[PDB]
Write a protein that binds this DNA or RNA. Structure first.
Ligand SMILES: [Cl-]
Ligand SMILES: [Cl-]
Ligand SMILES: [Cl-]
Ligand SMILES: [Cl-]
Ligand SMILES: [Cl-]
Ligand SMILES: [Cl-]
Ligand SMILES: [Cl-]
Ligand SMILES: [K+]
Ligand SMILES: [Mg+2]
Ligand SMILES: [Mg+2]
Ligand SMILES: [Mg+2]
Ligand SMILES: [Mg+2]
Ligand SMILES: [Mg+2]
Ligand SMILES: [Mg+2]
Ligand SMILES: [Mg+2]
Ligand SMILES: [Mg+2]
Ligand SMILES: [Mg+2]
Ligand SMILES: [Mg+2]
Ligand SMILES: [Mg+2]
Ligand SMILES: [Mg+2]
Ligand SMILES: [Mg+2]
Ligand SMILES: [Mg+2]
Ligand SMILES: [Mg+2]
Ligand SMILES: [Mg+2]
Ligand SMILES: [Mg+2]
Ligand SMILES: [Mg+2]
Ligand SMILES: [Mg+2]
Ligand SMILES: [Mg+2]
Ligand SMILES: [Mg+2]
Ligand SMILES: [Mg+2]
Ligand SMILES: [Mg+2]
Ligand SMILES: [Mg+2]
Ligand code: NA
Ligand code: NA
Ligand code: NA
Ligand code: NA
Ligand code: NA
Ligand code: NA
Ligand code: NA
Ligand code: NA
Ligand code: NA
Ligand code: NA
Ligand code: NA
Ligand code: NA
Ligand code: NA
Ligand code: NA
Ligand code: NA
Ligand code: NA
Ligand code: NA
Ligand code: NA
Ligand code: NA
Ligand code: NA
Ligand code: NA
Ligand code: NA
Ligand code: NA
Lengths: 172, 132, 337, 160, 142
RNA sequence: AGCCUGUGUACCAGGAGGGGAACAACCCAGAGAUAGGUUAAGGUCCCCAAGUGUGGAUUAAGUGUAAUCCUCUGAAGGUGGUCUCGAGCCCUAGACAGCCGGGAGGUGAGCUUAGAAGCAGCUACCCUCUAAGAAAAGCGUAACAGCUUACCGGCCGAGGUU
RNA sequence: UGUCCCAACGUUGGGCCCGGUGAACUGUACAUUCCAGUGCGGAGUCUGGAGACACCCAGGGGGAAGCGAAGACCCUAUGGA
RNA sequence: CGAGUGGCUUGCUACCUCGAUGUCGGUUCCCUCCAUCCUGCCCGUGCAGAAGCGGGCAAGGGUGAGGUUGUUCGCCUAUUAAAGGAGGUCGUGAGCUGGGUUUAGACCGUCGUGAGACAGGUCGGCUGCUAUCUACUGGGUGUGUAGGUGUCUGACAAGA
RNA sequence: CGCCACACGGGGUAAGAGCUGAACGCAUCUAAGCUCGAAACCCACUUGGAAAAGAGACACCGCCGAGGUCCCGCGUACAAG
């Protein structure tokens, strides 16, 4: 099979080996697209994903490579944004971006601060009780966002009662 | 538990017959177990000054005799070490019968007591005439 | 159902054989954090006494109070870093590249070595720097020896040579730091490396005891009760099951016990001084009188009096340094009585 | 006791009741279920449970599965639903057990079983096109209570 | 150092076993062989299982012993020994006239043997010797 | 049962040699000495003589590389893992899915009931508007409200579904 | 009250080294073995691997189904008492 | 109801040993298995919390002291994080013990005319050997690498 | 029976919690890819270790002389050695 992806005018995509770099006004993203017998090339102004095999396993990945590239096109232009809302019941939770990692303090009344390092060139803007994770690499952003929600994981007690923590409000 | 503030060479064992330093009606005590203690194969469970042991009443009033109560070790013949190096030892081995709240069962504590026992069992401490 | 029980003795210090070198050899070194410096020193065990100290621990309820602490006295005179050995990074691990020596040698170093008569320092230095330029320079350590002659109680004059590592800021800077120390005459002191209050790792070759039975050597039991009177007293039950049909090396057996190398971790340096402040009345039994550069180490140290013991900045300390502890008293009472 | 002891057809046919005595009765309640007054032809759909391997199924097993199948139909079509199921095989083969070691080992009578050759119909239900998925589920529950693997074969019914 | 190898083989991206099989045949033939870039040699299959087999070999042992190598250096040589009657005079002579090296210590580039190459474009399920060695706990000297 | 006890037969016993890792009875094979040659069983990546043989396909589990077997397990049951062959229905008069929009009136149908208005229960389940839209398939409220399902239209565009 | 917790130190005689004296048990052969397998189903010797430079001193006895006794148990014998 | 795994129990068989492979229980000392009792990390809950209950991964470490009984098993007490189960010739008598089974003495009950018997009870009732080989714990002497002194490296190996 | 010392932290995983993501336009933690996550694994730390047959490296001394053994006084060592 073969799928041609017309690259946006704002974008500039280059590929060496199995690594594909996509550059745009919002930044640059590089990914490795490695799978048996699937060749991904840059033909002038269209990325080609093709293979001689048409089996279910191959088709699965060709479809995966497509969405990965499209998402890169979108990231280097419009970008990726996840919204979050910090919520607490009794203990006022302080959330700050310190250095290269969002730090959460006094979670559920804890003395020890919970922290997690931000992935890649992802930006975590905080304004009051709202957070906004953004960047060109959906992989890095989506994870950083998830890491934030996961940072307030609770296994010891009932989640339905103890509902404190940050949460993904808007998904791109 | 809270640090004794003294190194202790346990001088008692499970089965040891000691003195009940109080007016409860129980005169002689028999050590049965040592709270929070777990030994090793063949080792006879050891108890020392500052420990909360389980006891059986060997001698005393028919009422108290044959009962299984908790107690605190107040005195022991085998020495103990203090921060300044000095060793301290008593004329006998003794314990004071205690309840669930670690409050002495009886009203009065006969004979002297170790100061280190105070940091652990206050109600027992603030019931002693002498504290060495 | 036969209660469980941990095995008799550790399998981590074997084989339990006689040590190859009476002089200990560290198989680990501290990290390259601070400024360039030698990562170790040595001395000679003298004996023990107690010291009265002020509680240094901020987390202790006794903080500030008097406290009696056991101490081993070790005569630690100046040593001499006679050479700079550079290792190169090869596909088979680290390998000695070359050495930079000196001319100023202690009068009695030849009692052990074939002291250099014709050596080219510069060439070696060049080779080391060229290797560094190539990015093949492993680490840098100094060849060091003691001055037993400086310690009267110690009969030997034949110096104990040992290689100590230099951990510094950058490879380029500690290289220079090393070269400098050496050029002078390699003379250095415990003050140069340590400061009272720091934790050191003391390595040493334990007190020898010759051959000993399982009971002493592995801490196995003695036959008990009736069994103790049958003809067996200090011999273990059996050498192993029917199968496997062989005695496993893990069963507690007779052999060389003592005279092994040991590296005790986190030894607090109570005080580094000089003179006779620590010497015991009537002399340290089986050692002598201490009147010179010394180190007071908290607690015990491996080895017998007169033995060589090595120091090293604790590679895995649990506590934070509590510098220069207050010594309100040092016992000088006789160790006989 | 396990079916492993009686599932194979290796011993001779032991059915002659004129020579065997003390044979336990069959646990099989009844072979004909549903609306037995109505005829099999009065139904558009006919689904049989086909045993894929030649085996011996003990009476407790025939009862255990028949029950679990019909009990489902009663639950889905009602105690008087419009269907009729049939357990066509009967446990003629008498089973022994040597319950002394191998001396005078001829066993004593402990039970009965049905010999089913592979490809045969053990159960056959007749229903109306709507209840066809229920009868298929009854059989899926039934084949879980007998030794062999089975096929749920739909005979007259091309309403898919 | 200095091994007068008649043949220098490059194992980079080559299937270890197949290379090993050919090196043995040549060593028994009298050829002095030097296997090069062993850390970069390859071995197909599901990594997790491959590693399990090698970790088990490291664990297997007793007083008598079972010295199993962890470095790609030794692993490749042991792989080759398994293809030679190393206990026989002729077999030991061959095995000793063969040597594996990390990287390439020679001036010449090693030659890639026929049928030993693995097409990385066509394959995703395989492992590198170094990758196995690092997992085994070997000190990465290469 | 590597059990006990028959029967026919061939073998071991008393049968070498070749193969099977080894191994009385499994395979080839029945064998004077010596010698050249060709095969049998079995095998041809190395160990190890002969293929890293050819055409084609499957498998990603190291499955497997294990004829027979005390010896080599692996079962009922299950599997949108993957490959292949067929049948029925739907589809550029636009299918399947997704997203958007609409899902309306007489009327909150009658009855029951303080109340019940698609949706506690009982009965019926009619006709208008219209391109659709149930006297309502599923949640929801005390009952309403609120949320989707049926059904229609739109966007999209190629196969889809059983 | 060292039977035990829980072991220590010491004493005498041995043990170890040297001079002198000087046996016995045991021995199909070979034999540096270990893990597995196989085999009359409990192998240092067969098969596959692993390990293994030779000799010597001391040790406590895991294995040689260790050495010692043509099994006392059990059955058999047209045995004995 | 149906399908299995294990090889701890019991039974079956009679392949191995009757020119002997020393018993049960215990002890001591070593290794292992996981079907996990505790401890680490998890999922569900009839999960508010606390205390639990059920399940998953996981064998690193731990899993102890006592009263009756020869007992294994088991019953019981107090402690405990918990006081898990099992394999190694039912690990371990050229290691120990010798209370039980099972010699010769004796008694009681039952049976027998009797000698005498008992899948009944009871008291007493022996533990051989100087290690040749192999195995391992430790100690030396030589040879190989191919003049010496001193310092190291680290393939690998052990650890809880 | 007394006294001293005996981590943490990294890396990769299991069960599990997830991200991006297709086969299957949606959905999906998995199929390719990725972020995490056990007292368990690897490193770290301790002990042994040139007989590692690829039998190692460096430095200096020396080949008519460096160094070693014997001998002598002794032990921080030791059953002989
Ligand atoms: Cl207890
Ligand atoms: Cl004993
Ligand atoms: Cl090993
Ligand atoms: Cl060979
Ligand atoms: Cl692949
Ligand atoms: Cl013939
Ligand atoms: Cl494999
Ligand atoms: K016998
Ligand atoms: Mg809770
Ligand atoms: Mg005991
Ligand atoms: Mg005796
Ligand atoms: Mg003294
Ligand atoms: Mg005094
Ligand atoms: Mg015959
Ligand atoms: Mg060939
Ligand atoms: Mg397999
Ligand atoms: Mg078969
Ligand atoms: Mg062999
Ligand atoms: Mg006989
Ligand atoms: Mg008899
Ligand atoms: Mg007669
Ligand atoms: Mg024997
Ligand atoms: Mg498990
Ligand atoms: Mg273990
Ligand atoms: Mg046994
Ligand atoms: Mg046992
Ligand atoms: Mg024995
Ligand atoms: Mg014996
Ligand atoms: Mg003996
Ligand atoms: Mg007896
Ligand atoms: Mg008795
Ligand atoms: Mg008796
Ligand atoms: Na004796
Ligand atoms: Na004796
Ligand atoms: Na034995
Ligand atoms: Na009978
Ligand atoms: Na079935
Ligand atoms: Na492979
Ligand atoms: Na190994
Ligand atoms: Na014949
Ligand atoms: Na053969
Ligand atoms: Na395999
Ligand atoms: Na005594
Ligand atoms: Na032995
Ligand atoms: Na089974
Ligand atoms: Na059995
Ligand atoms: Na015999
Ligand atoms: Na026993
Ligand atoms: Na465990
Ligand atoms: Na008991
Ligand atoms: Na036995
Ligand atoms: Na015994
Ligand atoms: Na005995
Ligand atoms: Na980890
Ligand atoms: Na060497």
């Amino acid at each position: 099979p073969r799928v041609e992806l017309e690259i946006p005018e704002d974008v500039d995509a280059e590929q060496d080996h199995l690594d594909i770099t996509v550059e745009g006004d919002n930044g640059s993203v590089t990914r490795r697209l490695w799978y048996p017998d699937i060749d991904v090339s840059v033909d002038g102004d269209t990325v080609v994903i093709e293979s001689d095999e048409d089996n279910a396993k191959t088709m699965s990945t060709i479809g995966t490579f497509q969405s990965h590239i499209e998402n890169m096109f979108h990231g280097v232009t419009e970008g990726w944004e996840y919204g979050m809302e910090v919520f607490y019941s009794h203990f006022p939770m302080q959330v700050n971006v310190e250095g290269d990692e969002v730090v959460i303090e006094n979670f559920l009344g804890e003395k020890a601060p919970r922290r997690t390092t931000i992935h890649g060139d992802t930006d975590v803007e905080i304004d009051g009780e709202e957070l906004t994770v953004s960047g060109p690499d959906i992989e890095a952003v989506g994870q950083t966002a998830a890491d934030i929600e996961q940072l307030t994981r609770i296994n010891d007690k009932d989640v339905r009662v103890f509902q404190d923590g940050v949460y993904i409000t808007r998904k791109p | 538990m809270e640090a004794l503030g003294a190194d202790v060479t346990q001088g008692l064992e499970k089965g040891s017959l000691i003195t009940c330093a109080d007016n409860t009606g129980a005169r002689e005590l028999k050590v049965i177990s040592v709270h929070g203690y777990s030994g090793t194969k063949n080792r006879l469970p050891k108890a020392g000054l500052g420990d909360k042991i389980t006891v059986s009443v060997t001698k005393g009033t028919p009422e108290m005799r044959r009962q299984v109560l908790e107690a605190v070790v107040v005195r022991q013949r085998k020495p103990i070490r203090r921060p300044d190096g000095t060793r301290v030892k008593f004329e006998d081995n003794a314990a004071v019968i205690v309840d669930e709240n670690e409050d002495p069962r009886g009203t009065e504590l006969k004979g002297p007591i170790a100061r280190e026992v105070a940091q652990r069992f206050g109600s027992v401490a603030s019931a002693a005439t002498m504290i060495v | 159902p036969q209660p469980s029980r941990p095995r008799k003795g550790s399998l981590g210090f074997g084989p339990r054989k006689r040590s190859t070198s009476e002089t200990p050899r560290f198989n680990s070194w501290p990290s390259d954090d601070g400024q360039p410096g030698v990562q170790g020193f040595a001395g000679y065990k003298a004996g023990m006494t107690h010291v009265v100290l002020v509680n240094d621990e901020p987390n202790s309820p006794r903080e500030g109070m008097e406290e009696t602490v056991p101490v081993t006295v070790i005569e630690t005179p100046p040593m001499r870093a006679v050479a700079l050995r550079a290792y190169e990074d090869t596909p088979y691990g680290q390998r000695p590249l070359t050495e930079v020596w000196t001319d100023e040698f202690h009068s009695e170093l030849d009692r052990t070595l074939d002291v250099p008569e014709d050596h080219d320092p510069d060439a070696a230095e060049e080779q080391i720097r060229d290797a560094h330029e190539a990015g093949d320079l492993g680490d840098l350590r100094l060849i060091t020896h003691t001055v037993p002659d400086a310690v009267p109680s110690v009969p030997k004059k034949k110096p104990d040579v040992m290689e100590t590592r230099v951990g510094g800021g950058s490879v380029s800077d500690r290289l220079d730091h090393a070269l400098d120390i050496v050029e002078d005459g390699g003379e250095h002191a415990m003050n140069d490396i340590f400061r009272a209050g720091e934790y050191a790792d003391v390595a040493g070759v334990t007190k020898g005891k010759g051959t000993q039975g399982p009971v002493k050597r592995w801490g196995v039991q003695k036959r008990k009760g009736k069994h103790a009177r049958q003809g067996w007293r200090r011999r273990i039950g059996n050498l192993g099951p029917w199968n496997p049909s062989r005695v496993r090396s893990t069963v507690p057996q007779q052999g060389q016990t003592g005279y092994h190398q040991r590296t005790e971790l986190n030894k607090r340096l109570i005080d580094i001084g000089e003179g006779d402040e620590p010497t015991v009345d009537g002399g340290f039994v089986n050692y002598g009188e201490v009147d010179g550069p010394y180190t007071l180490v908290k607690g015990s140290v491996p080895g017998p009096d007169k033995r060589l013991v090595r120091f090293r900045p604790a590679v895995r300390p649990n506590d934070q340094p509590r510098l220069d502890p207050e010594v309100r008293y040092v016992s000088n009472e006789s160790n006989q009585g | 006791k396990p079916a492993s002891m009686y599932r194979d057809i290796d011993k001779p046919a032991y059915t002659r009741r004129e020579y065997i005595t003390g044979i336990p009765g069959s646990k099989i309640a009844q072979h004909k279920m549903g609306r037995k007054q109505k005829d099999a032809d009065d139904y558009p759909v006919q689904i049989s449970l086909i045993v894929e391997e030649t085996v011996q199924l003990r009476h407790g097993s025939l009862e255990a599965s028949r029950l679990s199948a019909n009990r489902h139909l009663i639950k889905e079509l009602g105690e008087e639903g419009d269907y009729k199921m049939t357990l066509r095989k009967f446990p003629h083969q008498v089973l022994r057990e040597n319950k002394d070691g191998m001396r005078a080992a001829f066993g004593k009578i402990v039970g009965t079983a049905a010999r089913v050759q592979a490809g045969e119909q053990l159960f056959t239900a007749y229903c109306n096109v709507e209840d066809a998925e229920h009868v298929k589920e009854a059989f899926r529950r039934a084949y879980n209570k007998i030794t062999p693997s089975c096929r749920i074969d739909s005979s007259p019914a091309g309403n898919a | 150092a200095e091994f007068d190898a008649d043949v220098i083989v490059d194992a980079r991206d080559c299937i270890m076993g197949r290379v090993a099989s050919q090196v043995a045949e040549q060593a028994l033939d009298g050829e002095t062989v030097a296997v090069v870039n062993a850390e970069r040699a390859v071995i197909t299959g599901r990594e997790e299982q491959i590693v399990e087999k090698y970790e088990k070999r490291v664990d297997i042992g007793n007083d008598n012993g079972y010295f199993y190598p962890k470095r790609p250096d030794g692993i490749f040589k042991r792989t080759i020994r398994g293809m030679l009657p190393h206990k026989k005079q002729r077999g030991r002579e061959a095995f000793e006239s063969v040597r594996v090296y990390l990287g390439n210590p020679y001036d010449e580039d090693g030659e890639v043997l026929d049928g030993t190459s693995l097409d990385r474009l066509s394959n995703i399920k395989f492992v590198t010797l170094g990758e196995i060695s690092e997992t085994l706990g070997a000190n990465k000297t290469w």
